[model samples]
Target chain A: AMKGDTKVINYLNKLLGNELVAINQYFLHARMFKNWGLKRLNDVEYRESIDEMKHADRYIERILFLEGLPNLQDLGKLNIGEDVEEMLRSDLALELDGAKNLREAIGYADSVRDYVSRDMMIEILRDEEGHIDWLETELDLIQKMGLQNYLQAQI
Target chain B: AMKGDTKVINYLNKLLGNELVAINQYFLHARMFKNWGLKRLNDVEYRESIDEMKHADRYIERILFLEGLPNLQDLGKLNIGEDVEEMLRSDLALELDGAKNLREAIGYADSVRDYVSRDMMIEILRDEEGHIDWLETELDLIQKMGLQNYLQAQI
Candidate 1:
């Protein structure tokens, strides 16, 4: 219902397409956890993984109903890091970027007076914030262990 | 167009839906990189991050002209790793999954008589492969560091 708002349809559609991509990338991260013996994180990763998938579904449904094609593309290039510490560093970057985008989306919604998008952004913003929190904590832990030593062990 | 064919449409739509999710997740990661003061990786991450936006354009155009919107969802809850290396490892698994999806798309495209969608799939396949390669590299790095030390240092 909220997604169908005419004023915000384009923005929502674009966002929908974007979410689909995020889901796959994160799921990969979750699986990587299994490989790394991080069973606990793997368990938690499953939920966020599902959330990304659902985001794709919602967007696809709305886009089709609106008679617009979703903007989509190849998975594109991923620069996975050389070591564990570096990898964490990369992951942290991704989470923070997500937070920033949510802010942008919210601001865009406000500018256009699309309350529905704004509301959606509010929820998304919170989610991104959570990711940031988790990543920050992880970053702190990695730094404490001595970044070089950590990377070498993982390698 | 290949996208007009049922097989082709399904493949592209899946790609489209998945990419949407990636866009969201990558943005989160990108911002975190900037925050951590990791400039080089941050730039690379941001560059790759923009790929999602382009994907949105491609998928929507294809969806409208060929198949139609496939159902997509948002990023559902996934257990994120307790540490950075775990997260990277998770990303590796996710990219491999993305590659699997791309292979399916490739197969579907092979059956299509339409040139446009087939070409799109071909090009997209390359990108999917690239993502897989990157993730594998990242995963290897995480493994060497050992979870305890890597997480301690990066966090």
Candidate 2:
């Protein structure tokens, strides 16, 4: 019956919705990797995507536990144009956003000494870093191989 | 600055531990699936397992947020003989335990009407159900084809 603070819960709900969006988008990308025959990356990305979804659900649960309202919103619409570079940039943006938000959450938790929140932010930070590394490596590899050859090469 | 009950913290810790155990076990199984040439299943399971790990991390964070300690005792310790059948039986048992535990969590959430806890429990209920269903279906299918033959064919 205990309630959570409104300010915290509202902020969390906003953050959580974005997380859900990112998870769904990432999972779709992982499946694309599978289509491209990149089994290893696909395998890794798929797992990470699921993790993001679960985090969203967990955060939502906490919000409710604190007597906060759950935000009912779809993962955001994709803003990326159909260009490959645009797609890459969009992907990078999402990861950057995720990382930035996580960092912000960490800072907030630190101010409050909310270990649970701080820890969650840190875990996400690790994942965000991995994602950034992966995306950069992938883009560089794509560039090195050239567009036509890279496109033709099976994953 | 409010502290959570220790009982809640302990249960959360156990749940978190199970997620870690699941991550390790699922990773192992995903590798086996790939070895057996079941790429699709391997990818799916691998991804799902990572989600479980994320869930573990989230729980750990929540505990920390509440300023509670996370119980990090060894989560995995199997004592089965070198029989494949027994190994599978053990996995099945563990999956059942997971489902039972989720159900119990839901019950507890209901008892206190803790909104966040209840929301989380319900979300997790679906996930655990999926795991049980996947494992049960595979086990039943294998048995129908004769376990020995199934094992031989799987690889």
Candidate 3:
């Protein structure tokens, strides 16, 4: 096994918990959208859930490579909003937080001269930023078009 | 929310745990292979981890649709093998058990006249069987050609 920074492994495990929470929250929100007949919204949210799981896989693997077992037993609390608008906002919040934390962790990786880990985290941070942008666009469009009209299009 | 059998929701949750375990185990094994420079095995195992997460998403969505909250907080134990061949055996055992449990769950769905859930389980069963067959083939090839010959190709 290669030498790894203890802090990096802890960060990876913490972020894995975050990813797991997003998976559960987005997954439920996706189906709840379908339950309300919003197939378009459901499809996007469902894909997000899968992407979140992909991110988790990377963290899990990296942790393993670092000679530390991932703490898969710890899934963070899921924030499930009551309605469509609230749900999107909740997802946006998650992405925003994820982006911020990833930047902090990336900085830590750089401070330790862990170029490979930093490079790897950059990929995830880019995705987090992209998701944040997408969530913002959806929320803004919902406001501009009105919930009724937006919901109609989603149907 | 639609009325759903309590037993079905429980079964879904149980199966969800199994999927989560597979995801964790396969994800780790994938990287372990890569650590040992077996890129081919790593690729397949990585894809399997993603597919296992896909299966978990289905259970999460179905449980939500049935008015039951999924127990994402609990992940079952991960069975990681010491090496590649042991890893394959572990994965095959997982698929075998998954197929059997899915059949039992499908039968219960049929008994309850939950045609939709039964149909869904059949799809999963088919995939599980396919994975089992693939694993069996890999293991059989290892035996026929000898481990050294097989490992050479995987390299």
Candidate 4:
């Protein structure tokens, strides 16, 4: 294994934990949509879960490449909402929170002269922003079309 | 929620648990290969994790459609391997075991005339067999080239 610095490794592990939590929460939300016959919403949420797994894979690989122990045992609390409206809110909040953390991690990676890690974090932030955009759109749709009409179109 | 048969719902939940466990274990194994600079192995393992998540998504959706609570909290044990060789073995064993369970579930679904779910399980078995094929090829490669040469080639 190549020698690696502990500080960088910690950030990767921290992001990794958040990705795992997102994966679970997204999985649950996707299925909940399917249960309600909201096929469009189900597809979107399912795709998001897959995206989180993709993100988690990158973090794990980076951690291992840096000779750090990839911690699979540590998991954070999942902010699973009770209903469709609340679920979208919960997802939007999580993405916004993650974006802030990602920015700090990217800054740290840049400061440490780990240009590669910085670039990787930036790419993840791109995805985080995209998800937040979609969540915001859905919330807005609920207000404009009224919840029932908008959800009807999702079928 | 629509009424659902308990026996069929239980089968879906059981398979869903197995799929969730596979997702975690495969995710870890994939990262371990990436850690060791085995890029080829890492990609394969990584792709497997994505496939497990896809399978889990289907099971989750199906369970919800049946009005069963998709239990996210009941994850089974993760069989994480300490090294590449053992990791492959663990994945193989998991797929084999899952295939058997899948076959039984498919049979049950057919008996109940839930043709859609039976068809879904058959598709999953197709993927399971495909993974088993690739792992078998890697195991053979190890024998032919010797461990050092095989791993060296993975880079």
Candidate 5:
């Protein structure tokens, strides 16, 4: 087993906590969308939640490989919005923060010469960027098309 | 590293391949449900896909701990259907096969005295059985309510 620096492991686990929140939040929103009969939106949110879950699993695997304790119990808060527009807004805000966190994580990994983790964080950052882009595009669509009209197609 | 039996590793890898197919098939069906505006069905399929992904990850982790290579390259076939009824029938058939495979895997693990793997397979089998039950229920609903009326609310 590879023994990684404790500091880096701790830092990554904090990010993992946020990822846990993302997974739960997205899953909750997907269920809510299903209740509203918005299958397309539900599918998108569920897949995104799976993406976050995979990210969390990878982080946990890295921690395990490094002989570090993964702090899965310390999860961040879930933000399930009241409506579709609010959900998109929440996701946009979270994705922005997630991107920032990944960048910081990459820098920290670099400082510690943890090239493996740096590369992983870089890949995860790409996904976070995509999430941000999608959320922004959806938000723009809502602004232009009107929520009722857009939801008519979705529901 | 624990030197688990090569035979056991290979067997698990084979199961992992089928799990890979399950991941893809469930995801594909979820997308199809989205197009048909069946939010509840899409949510279930997406969640099931994540379950399969987690099963694959666990199998991989066990292989790693045993110092064996994970054979993720050998994936089984994806069987997505043209419509909701066809999708449920396909899923039911697949889940039945999956449950059978898990039973065999559990027996193999037991013969090898690999209690850990046996326990894991048992848990996965429970999930597979649940999927079978849900699919059967949905199929029954379609038969009772008639396709158009049943789908009217779902869509």
Candidate 6:
């Protein structure tokens, strides 16, 4: 493990916690979609959950490689909702939060002159943008087609 | 990418498909647990989902290293259930299947004299065994305490 970068590690741990929360929330959302009989939507949410897990794993590995303490226990709260529309809204909000946090992380990495960490954060931000775009598109679909109609087509 | 192991790469891609299925299934199950108001159980399933994603990533990376195509689209079907008990039972079955597949993968790696691949499969097998043990313990808890009572206490 490389040494000398406490600030980057600490910020990464916070992002890791966020990723864990997203994983849990999206996993729950996937099930909600399944219960609604929307198999395709379930696939999307499950895929997102997997993506969050990848983000979490990358953060954990980077912290370890930096010889920093990685806290897997700090599973932050989830904001999963009861229904499809509510769930999508919660995800959209969380996705925005993730993007904001990553932007801050990128700034912190740059300040620390840790170019590697900054690059990693930048790569993660690109994935976050894709996530945000998907969430937005899905939300728009719900708005135009109506939640019930959209879900009916999905099932 | 390591290169020079077509056999291992092909097997790993198949394994990648299985991991993707497990990730999707566990994610869906985690959601089902939440819908049933069993937060603790949901947490377990979500954590498992994260683990499966790690396995999938490892396989994908190895496949890419070996100059083989990694197929993320080959997500197999899930066998999640309608209720908590059924969901747990389904997970138990899935976990057992995972262990079995890993065992075979380890054997294939050994036959090819690819110690690196063998070691990786062995490492993943240990985790799969832990998964199976937990599934067994949870199933036992449900069997002895009764599903309804266990779920009631979970909430």
Which is the leading candidate under TM-score? Answer: 4
Docking class of 6: incorrect
Interface RMSD of 5: 19.5
DockQ of 3: 0.13
For every candidate, what is the interface RMSD in angstroms?
16.1, 21.3, 4.5, 3.6, 19.5, 16.7
Write model 2 residue lDDT over A9-125, tens digit each, in one string.
666766776675566455545544554466765677688777777777567556656666554333445442233444556677887887887788778767766666577668767
After superposing candidate 4, which stretches have Cα over 4 Å from the reference? A31-40, A76-82, A140-146, A153-155, B5-11, B34-58, B74-82, B85-155
Two-chain DockQ for model 2: 0.02
Candidate 6 runs further than 4 Å off: A72-74, B1-155
Taking the candidates one at a time, how many backbone clashes does each contain? 102, 12, 0, 0, 0, 1
**Alpha carbon lDDT of each predicted model:** 0.57, 0.63, 0.81, 0.81, 0.77, 0.76
Across residues B1-155, which tens digit of lDDT does each residue of candidate 5 receive? 47898878877877776675676567556756765568898899999988988987677677657756544342434355667898889788888987887888889889999998889889888888888998899999999999888899786
TM-score on alpha carbons, each prediction:
0.45, 0.45, 0.63, 0.65, 0.50, 0.51
| Clashing residue pairs, backbone N/CA/C < 3 A, model 5 | none
Proportion of native contacts kept per candidate = 0.02, 0.00, 0.09, 0.21, 0.00, 0.00
Classify candidate 2 by CAPRI docking class: incorrect
- Ranked by TM-score, the better of candidates 5 and 6 is 6
Model 1 per-residue lDDT tens digits across residues A1-155: 23344535566555654464455545545545545566655565667767755655555554445444343333333333334445456556765665576677668778877665577667766776776687677668668877656434445
Ranking by lDDT: 4, 3, 5, 6, 2, 1
Q: What is the DockQ (computed on Cα atoms) for candidate 6?
A: 0.02
Residue-wise lDDT of candidate 5 within A1-155, one digit each (tens)?
Answer: 57998877887777776685576467556756766789999899999998997887677667656767544333434354667998889878788987898888889899999999889889988998988888898889899999998899676
Candidate 4 chain B least-lDDT 10 residues: B70-79
lDDT of 1 by residue, B65-106 (tens): 763543333333332232345545554555566668777676
lDDT (Cα, tens digit) per residue for candidate 4, span B19-95: 87687777788768876788888898888888988998788778777777665454544456666777888888888
